[PDB]
Design a protein around this ligand. Structure first.
Ligand code: CA
Ligand code: CA
Ligand code: CA
Ligand code: CA
Ligand code: CA
Length: 182
């Protein structure tokens, strides 16, 4: 679908726009591809991702964090942020540099908004200067404009000692195309 998890990377809130990058050709009810976006995360911010095949290649709808990812028994999550709680190794309730999954997590920033993730568009948490993520959030259910939404918001720490927002989003999309494709 179009449900997502994102980080505020430059420290002024998670922000979204209408799509214009790839939108000069739109997918249709028989042409296979990715579900047609009308809005997306603006390039100062990034999506939280993981290759579930461990080679650092994002291609499937579970590889985005969001309500279409699964928990450690194979169940879908009720809220995509809570799927991060399976990844804490020691039970301190932070995702930090001592957890194995900290190296497996990545962040995606797409400048062309084509819905495919390519290798230059990805960041590891250490290359992104992240030190920890909090497994704690509040429900905010806030509009972001252009049909986009922020459901829930938590927090993260940078290696430079700055702290910033992270959260669960709904991104704007074509409703019929989002039923022809997942
Ligand atoms: Ca921002
Ligand atoms: Ca994959
Ligand atoms: Ca959600
Ligand atoms: Ca931990
Ligand atoms: Ca791309």
């Amino acid at each position: 679908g179009s449900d997502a998890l994102a980080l505020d990377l430059d420290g002024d809130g998670i922000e979204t726009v209408a799509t214009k990058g790839f939108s000069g050709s739109l997918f249709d009810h028989n042409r296979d591809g990715i579900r047609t976006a009308t809005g997306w995360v603006s390039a100062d911010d990034g999506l939280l991702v993981r290759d579930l095949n461990g080679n650092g290649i994002i291609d499937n709808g579970a590889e985005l964090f969001g309500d279409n990812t699964k928990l450690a028994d194979g169940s879908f999550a009720k809220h995509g942020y809570a799927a991060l709680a399976e990844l804490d190794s020691n039970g301190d309730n932070i995702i930090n540099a001592a957890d194995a999954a900290f190296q497996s997590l990545r962040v995606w920033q797409d400048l062309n908004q084509d819905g495919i993730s390519q290798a230059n568009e990805l960041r590891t948490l250490e290359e992104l200067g992240i030190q920890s993520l909090d497994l704690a959030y509040k429900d905010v259910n806030k509009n972001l404009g252009n049909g986009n939404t922020l459901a829930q918001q938590g927090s993260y720490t940078k290696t430079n000692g700055t702290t910033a927002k992270m959260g669960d989003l709904l991104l704007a999309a074509d409703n019929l195309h989002s039923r022809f494709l997942e």
